[PDB]
């Protein structure tokens, strides 16, 4: 209910802010969106045994049979006389010119299990279908359609840092490399440095690091049966888009030291907890407010190549609050300001 209230407040406050050049979504609004997605996942975690997917696909968050049974979706659609639902019906891909419209459209399409065209992600008659190609194509098409639509809006309104990442359940057996080489093969404009940089950073990282890395994994997440293995440093945008939080279950497979950023402090810095032992790590610290919650993990090791070592820098591992100071490209990346940071597990 608190997440829905925060969502309403964000939509009401950002309904007139026009999407312009060098605009970005604030940390508070990103945390609100993240909490909405997490509560939508948590409302119906598992699936009923009567209608179960033999492939292990998360049908409980993609099928209309489970969306309409989800109580969080019903409460979101009937919070205040369907005011959010009424505004949603007058929004499409080629008409959005405001930040609140962008957020409402993307989040409501995610939580209702519908694409931007209007079709559901996976139909109710294909829950128990054993055809792997059909379900895989549907999931990949849903994720690619979300990312494409965001990049199309980025090209049309000439914005640079608008980013609502596809959640973790829309990456079931979906190759990140294929997504990058299918979205950026056409629309060469997408390659411009002034159009869609955060989406480019999100897709490039998932094209070089797969969901499962077998024995090369140095870190693993787990949230309601969805897992993801990381070998490099995990920036804030990756965890924000995928939907994982630093307060979830984290499994260390190596003795390399990690820096789990949890929250911001009053000295314009970030507070982190350091772990350098094998085991299951779950941060005991209290969850901060939506304006002070940061999800980023940095691997302090030298085994990673210099080709992708720029992801571990402080100014790019955590998205800057100022829109013009957001660093996403490898060339524009700095590691400064560790004096402002602090340690919480002393």
């Amino acid at each position, epitope marked *: 209910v608190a997440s829905i209230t925060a969502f309403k407040s964000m939509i009401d406050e950002t309904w007139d802010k026009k999407i312009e050049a060098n605009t970005c979504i604030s940390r508070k609004h990103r945390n609100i969106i993240h909490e909405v997605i997490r509560d939508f996942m948590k409302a119906y975690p598992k699936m009923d045994e009567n209608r179960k997917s033999p492939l292990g696909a998360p049908m409980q968050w993609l099928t209309q049979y489970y969306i309409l049974k989800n109580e969080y979706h019903k409460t979101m659609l009937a919070y205040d006389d369907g005011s959010l639902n009424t505004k949603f019906k007058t929004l499409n891909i080629y008409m959005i010119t405001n930040v609140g419209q962008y957020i409402l459209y993307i989040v409501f399409c995610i939580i209702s299990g519908k694409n931007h065209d209007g079709t559901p992600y996976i139909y109710d008659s294909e829950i128990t279908s054993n055809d792997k190609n059909l379900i895989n194509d549907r999931i990949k098409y849903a994720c690619k359609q979300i990312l494409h639509g965001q990049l199309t809006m980025a090209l049309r309104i000439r914005n640079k840092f608008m980013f609502i990442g596809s959640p973790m359940y829309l990456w079931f057996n979906v190759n990140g490399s294929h997504v990058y080489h299918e979205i950026y093969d056409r629309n060469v404009g997408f390659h411009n440095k002034e159009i869609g940089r955060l989406l480019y950073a999100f897709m490039y990282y998932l094209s070089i690091s797969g969901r499962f890395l077998n024995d090369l994994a140095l870190l693993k997440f787990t949230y309601l049966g969805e897992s993801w293995t990381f070998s490099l440093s995990v920036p804030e945008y990756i965890l924000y888009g995928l939907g994982y939080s630093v307060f979830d*279950t984290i*499994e260390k*497979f190596s*003795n390399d030291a990690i820096l789990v950023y949890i929250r911001t402090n009053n000295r314009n810095g970030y507070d982190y*907890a350091e*772990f350098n*032992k*094998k*085991g*299951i*790590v*779950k*941060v*005991t*610290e*209290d*969850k901060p407010d939506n304006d002070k919650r940061i999800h980023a993990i940095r691997l302090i090791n030298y085994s990673s190549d210099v080709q992708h070592i720029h992801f571990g820098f402080r100014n790019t591992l955590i998205i800057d609050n100022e829109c013009t100071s957001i660093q996403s490209s490898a060339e524009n990346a700095t590691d400064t300001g560790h004096h402002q940071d602090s340690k919480i*597990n002393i």
Partner: antibody
Amino acid sequence: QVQLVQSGAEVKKPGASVKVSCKASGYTFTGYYMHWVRQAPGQGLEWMGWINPNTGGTNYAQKFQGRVTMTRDTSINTAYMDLSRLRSDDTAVYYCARGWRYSYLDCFDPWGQGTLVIVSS
Amino acid sequence: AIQMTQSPSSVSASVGDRVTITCRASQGISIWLAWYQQKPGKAPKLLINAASSLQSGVPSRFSGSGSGTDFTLTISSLQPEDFATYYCQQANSFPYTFGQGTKLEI
């Protein structure tokens, strides 16, 4: 030295309730998970759940669901476990086990002293 | 629940021998296995975490190995203070199920 002093042995009756305390010293009570593992006489170890002292959240086992209420009082660094509807098979040495490292929900070290809760008529 | 089964339930040995304890899991539990040591009348003591890492204070004679559903605890040279009951502990899936126990006797 990390110490976990527990309460004395309690001779309860069937259908009653037992509250086993666990006082911690030598380490920061918040930040380390407190687990509760019992050992029946002549049997192995059974896991009951963990309690996070900093937040207050808990995760009980399905076998001990609806009967265990793990509370904490951070003013005395004391951990409390309450077990209701004591049957005859609940007689065991209830240990409180701190996590082996800071916010590590993997292994238990140390294990305290133990409380011989004898449920008999 | 992932049941843990320990094969050598009673392993007689002498001072200066090599003892092997095997703990097989019903389902894959990754590298998340913890070995304990419980002398009679005392609380259990952790000796090896993550199935290959020795805890601080544990003598170097203990050495663990294994992955998936096969694990092994090895004592290079047995000592008179190593005669106790040893337990496994998986942590991949809740609840954390222990083992039956293996006891060393002279």
